[PDB]
Design a protein around this ligand. Structure first.
Ligand code: 82V
Length: 111
């Protein structure tokens, strides 16, 4: 049921935040600070920012009702990166590597 599937989601989230993936996960740890990065168009282009700390807070607060809602947020975070940046940018390469980790483990979701 949803509670058990959400445990698997929490396991994925913990893995994405773990040292094992830190070389390419680090940009996604916290909300994009557009002003600090000089990305003064970020909030005009990205209507729904997302990052792993926000996913974690939502999981901790039981905001996600099912695994599909969790997966939509994780995928939104990657999509924002693919939307904002040229496809050859280093941050896009990092997003793609982390999303591979996510999608292959999300596919192992139990019944
Ligand atoms: O979509 C993105 C685009 C950009 N940039 C900056 C680099 O050049 C291209 C435009 O950055 C990010 C980040 C990020 C980048 C650097 C950080 C960061 C976060 O948080 C902590 C300090 O350093 C995360 S998604 C994203």
């Amino acid at each position: 049921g949803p509670m058990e599937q959400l445990k698997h989601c929490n396991g994925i989230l913990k893995e994405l935040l773990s040292k094992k993936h830190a070389a390419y996960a680090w940009p996604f740890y916290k909300p994009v600070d557009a002003s600090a990065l000089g990305l003064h168009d970020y909030h005009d282009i990205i209507k729904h920012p997302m990052d792993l700390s926000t996913v974690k807070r939502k999981m901790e607060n039981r905001d996600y009702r099912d695994a599909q809602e969790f997966a939509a947020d994780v995928r939104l975070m990657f999509s924002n990166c693919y939307k904002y940046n040229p496809p050859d940018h280093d941050v896009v390469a990092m997003a793609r590597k982390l999303q591979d980790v996510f999608e292959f483990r999300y596919a192992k979701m139990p019944d």
